[PDB]
Ligand binder design. Structure first.
Ligand SMILES: O=C(/C=C/c1ccc(O)c(O)c1)O[C@@H](C(=O)O)[C@@H](OC(=O)/C=C/c1ccc(O)c(O)c1)C(=O)O
Lengths: 121, 121
């Protein structure tokens, strides 16, 4: 769920996940994908393609267990959907951290009509 | 869909919808409902209760047609769900404009633990 995803992003990036990634570029935040604006945005693009592959669970509401061991996100699920969902969320948290260096606040609150159509996943 | 909702909010309030309302108080944003902090937050509370009684369509993803006639949102659907959905979104956009006078930036990125449980819809 968003609770786990938000905590992962905080633990990896150190940033308030709502402030930094709740509305960034064409892919970080609500409703759909668009052609990514930069590497941070592309992380959220991959994350949304990751969610589309899920079958049998709801990525927004379904909770799962993970732990923070050796400063690493360690998913703690056997259920295939919950396990894949947790790895989707872990991957975007890591990707956002890796690309913090090119984060540009000018892409915060980017408007949808200014995004081109995204490619199929 | 959130596309139409965002456009209505922009047309009514003139404000960037994600900036002002993507994470405000306990109810504006993607964290469920909570006891509203002020009138703007109450608009979003009412909006989410409105979404909860929709049957037959997906409020986040289902796109619909409306018109901007004499600076009024005019819902242009007669399918019952899309019509109701359009009316939910129109009402929150108008409500948010009507309560700009007490909008308080201090409620941006309000932390969920400070929210109290919402009353039943
Ligand atoms: O539909 C929209 C906007 C939707 C939307 C917005 C914010 C949100 O947060 C959201 O969720 C949705 O805009 C589209 C529409 O008006 O029909 C359409 O606008 C235009 O073409 C405007 C062109 C133009 C304007 C000013 C000028 O000076 C000029 O020369 C040209 C387009 O941009 O594609």
């Amino acid at each position: 769920s968003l609770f786990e995803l938000g905590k992962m992003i905080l633990q990896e990036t150190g940033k308030n996940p709502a402030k930094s990634y709740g509305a960034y570029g064409c892919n970080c935040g609500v409703l759909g994908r668009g052609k990514p604006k930069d590497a941070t945005d592309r992380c959220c693009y991959v994350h949304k393609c990751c969610y589309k592959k899920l079958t049998g669970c709801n990525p927004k509401k379904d909770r799962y267990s993970y732990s923070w061991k050796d400063k690493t996100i360690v998913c703690g699920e056997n259920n295939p959907c919950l396990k894949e969902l947790c790895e989707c969320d872990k991957a975007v948290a890591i990707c956002l951290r890796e690309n913090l260096g090119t984060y540009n606040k000018k892409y915060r609150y980017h408007l949808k009509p200014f995004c081109k159509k995204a490619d199929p996943c």
